[PDB]
Each structure stands twice: as C-alpha cells, then as structure tokens.
From a paper:
AdmX recognizes indole-3-acetic acid (IAA), a key auxin phytohormone essential for plant growth and development (30–32), with an affinity that is about 60 times lower than that of its biosynthetic intermediate indole-3-pyruvic acid (IPA). AdmX-LBD exhibits the classical fold observed for the LBDs of LTTRs, which consists of two α/β subdomains, RD-I and RD-II, composed of αβα sandwiches with a Rossmann-like topology.
AdmX-LBD crystals were obtained in the presence of IAA and IPA, and the structures were determined to resolutions of 1.81 Å and 2.25 Å in the P21212 and P212121 space groups, respectively. In contrast to other members of the LTTR family, where effectors are generally accommodated in the hinge region between the RD-I and RD-II subdomains, both IAA and IPA, bound to the RD-II subdomain. The indole moiety of IAA and IPA establishes hydrogen bonds with Thr231 and Asp232 through the nitrogen present in the pyrrole ring, but it is also coordinated by diverse hydrophobic interactions with a number of nonpolar and negatively charged amino acids (Pro190, Gly191, Leu192, Leu195, Val212, and Glu213). The acetic and pyruvic acid groups of IAA and IPA, respectively, form hydrogen bonds with Cys100 and Cys215 involving the carboxylate and ketone groups. Although both auxins establish similar interactions with key residues, a stronger hydrogen bond network was determined for IPA, which is indicative of the higher binding affinity determined for this auxin. Instead, a higher number of water bridges and hydrophobic interactions were observed for IAA. In contrast, a short α10-helix (residues 183 to 186) was formed in the structure of AdmX-LBD in complex with IAA. The total number of interactions (e.g., hydrogen bonds and salt bridges) is much lower in the IAA than in the IPA structure, 14 versus 32, respectively, indicating a more tightly packed dimer in the presence of IPA, which also suggests a reduction in the flexibility of the dimer.
Residue numbers in the entry:
A (entry chain A): 44 to 247
B (entry chain B): 43 to 245
Write the structure that this text describes.
C-alpha cells in the first residue's frame, strides 16, 4: 500500500499530520507520502501523477480529476485589535485589510464584499496569521489556520456565519487500492469530526 | 506606486520573512507588498513566469536566466522527541524511524553524508514533518528555522559533523528591479544574514 496526499497549507499545519499519524500507527505495511502546496500546484501534481489525493477548497474539472465536496469549513475574521463576538463584513476597516491570495477564499469573501486593493497581499495562510499577530492588519481566513496560529481572542465568527467548501480531489481514470480507500474514509471521518468540535468552540 | 512580490520556502515564511517584511513595510509608505510561501520548484517556476519578483530558496539555479545572491549558511539539525542528549552523528541515526523529506535541496545535503533507505513515511513539507516529530512518530534532519518554530529546544540537536545548507535570494537575470525593490533586497539580505550570524553563535 502506497499513496501520496497533498493538502492546502492550512490543513498541513496540524490536522492532516494528526490524522495521518493516527492512521499510520493503526496500519503499518504502507508507504505514506505527504506534502502541502497551494491549489494550483496540487492540481498540477495530480495531473502529473506526483500525488494521488489532494485536499483543496475549490473544485476542478480538469482532465479526469474528480473533486468531492466532503465538508464545509468556517471562515473567521482575525485581528489583534479587540472585537466583541461576531463581525459583519461591512464593519471591517478596508484600510487594515490584508488581501488573501487563496482564490476560493477571496472569491467567497467577494460574494459578500469587494475590498479595494491594499498595500499588503498574502497568499499563504500562516504567513498572513503572522502579520495579524504583529498587528499589521486583519483578514478573513479558514478556522484551521486561525486556530493553529492565533489565540482564541483574536478569532471571530462572521455575521452572518461564513463557510467555504472543502474538497477531496483524485483522478477518476486512476484506481485506488483498498488501503488508500480505507485512508480516504478515515480522513473524511476525522475531518468531519474535527469540524464538529470546532463548531462547539466557535459558539459565542 | 512601488510594488514587489516575494516568494519564500515554507520554513522561512513561518516566522522570519513575515517579521522582516513587517519591518520594511512599515519603514516604506506607498508600497504594495505581495508575499507567498511555496516549494523550491514552484518558486523557480513562478520567477521564470514573472509571477514573483524574488524568491528565497536553499538551492542555486543552474545555468539559465536566474541570478542567485548567496545570503548565508543555514544550520541543519536533527529533531527527535525521544533523543535526550547532544550532537548526533549521521550514522547513529535510526533508519527505521527516519522520516524522509522527499527529493529537495535538504535531501541532497543529507545524501552527501548518508543514503537513508526507503522508509514508511515521506514528508515533503517542513512544518508537517515537525508535527510527526512532535507526536513521536519519527526523526528527521531539518533546517533550524522550521525546527525552532514548531519544536521545543529539547527536541533540536546539532549534527556531527555540523551540516549546513546555503540560503539564496533569486531574481530574474533579465529584469531590473525598481529602486524600492532593490532597497528591500538589501534590507532582507542583511537581516537574514544577521539573524543567522546570531543563530550560528547560539549553537
Ligand atoms: O494557504 C492556504 O491554506 C490558502 C489560504 C487559506 N487561508 C488563507 C488566508 C490568507 C491567504 C491564504 C490562505
Ligand atoms: O518545506 C520546506 O521549507 C523545505 C524543507 C525544509 N526543511 C524540511 C524538512 C522536511 C521536509 C521538507 C523541508
Ligand atoms: Mg493547530
Ligand atoms: Mg506551505
């Protein structure tokens, strides 16, 4: 059994290594490879057969890549500047906005508000969180990246609540092994379970 | 009216590049900064495609249209939850617990001293590997930046003989940087060098 999973950086910071660790400890006689890459690179690696599976927040219809919507992930407002509870997107100060590069994210936000161009554009979630921590500005990010890098006081639900879709991509012309099928099922169950606990913690 | 885009390796974006860019951004108004962290191959592709202006890597570029400024040498360290002591000889490392970092500049530096056989676990992003190490799953050799960022000092060990990898700032050979972007390059290179001079001392 041998498979390679690529994920977005927000998922590689902690959740995927936790899930992989639990599976790897329960199932030996396998070779697992893991990597974190932005979406465009994940799709390219699936098309070149450099990875078998990708976790993204955007569907694709390229080639024989099939994207399966597996969960909905909260989007949260993040800032060092104190906020009470939930944040309406129209209350955000566009002068402090850090524009996120994740197209899916920027596209989701843009459905609710078009932020003008700013002096700071950050395309990788954990680098944005560092700028938030140093007080340089504010952002909307996925909860996985916020939860990893920030204290709870810096994380705020949106009003109304905002989510982004989480997808599992694999090639359809390609065929999975049983162990890889078992891993995909385990991975999906643990991701859904984590989002359940996250919902509890986000409740204001 | 001044704009630049810098890509860096993940180990550098976890903390050091945001810190340095924060200091510059603030010293320079009327600036648009774009920052991204990507693996070496992607950085060089983006540089070639003109999607980024500058890339920080740990690998020079072969003959082509890329120029490469040698910033400093980066210590490599052994990381292990279970190892309690001091410097580790490469050949004393337990190959059954080895987490391979895939095929990258780091792996090439290790292979010049020891060729690890194939392992059950291959982890090609530094912070993901640090998570497996913190959970006790295996051991690795990594750059000092990713180690310091995710691990407690107890889990970080020097190698014997000491290993290093070179840090480069890459740019297109056929494109002239704007005056503010050159100023940022000088600032970045100096701060990175001095951060590593400080680290090399503490070791
Ligand atoms: O880097 C990623 O995982 C994509 C991404 C997720 N949240 C973000 C916030 C700001 C910029 C990029 C991202
Ligand atoms: O992911 C990166 O910055 C490259 C890299 C630096 N140290 C590492 C350890 C294990 C796997 C990859 C890396
Ligand atoms: Mg975390
Ligand atoms: Mg990354």
């Amino acid at each position: 059994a041998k498979f390679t999973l690529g994920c977005l950086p927000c998922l590689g910071l902690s959740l995927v290594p936790e899930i992989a660790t639990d599976f790897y400890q329960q199932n030996s006689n396998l070779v697992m490879t893991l990597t974190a890459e932005h979406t465009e690179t994940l799709v390219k690696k699936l098309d070149l057969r450099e990875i078998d599976l990708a976790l993204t927040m955007q569907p694709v219809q390229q080639g024989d890549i099939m994207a399966t919507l597996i969960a909905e992930v909260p989007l949260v407002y993040v800032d060092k500047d104190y906020r009470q509870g939930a944040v309406e997107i129209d209350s955000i100060d566009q002068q402090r906005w850090i524009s996120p590069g994740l197209d899916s994210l920027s596209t989701a936000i843009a459905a609710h508000r078009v932020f003008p161009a700013t002096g700071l554009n950050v395309e990788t979630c954990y680098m944005a969180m560092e700028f938030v921590k140093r007080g340089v500005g504010c952002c909307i990010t996925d909860i996985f990246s916020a939860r990893h890098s920030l204290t709870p006081e810096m994380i705020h639900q949106i009003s109304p609540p905002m989510k982004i879709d989480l997808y599992l991509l694999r090639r359809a012309d390609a065929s999975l092994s049983p162990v890889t099928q078992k891993f995909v099922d385990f991975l999906c169950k643990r991701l859904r379970n984590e989002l359940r606990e996250i919902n509890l913690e986000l409740y204001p």
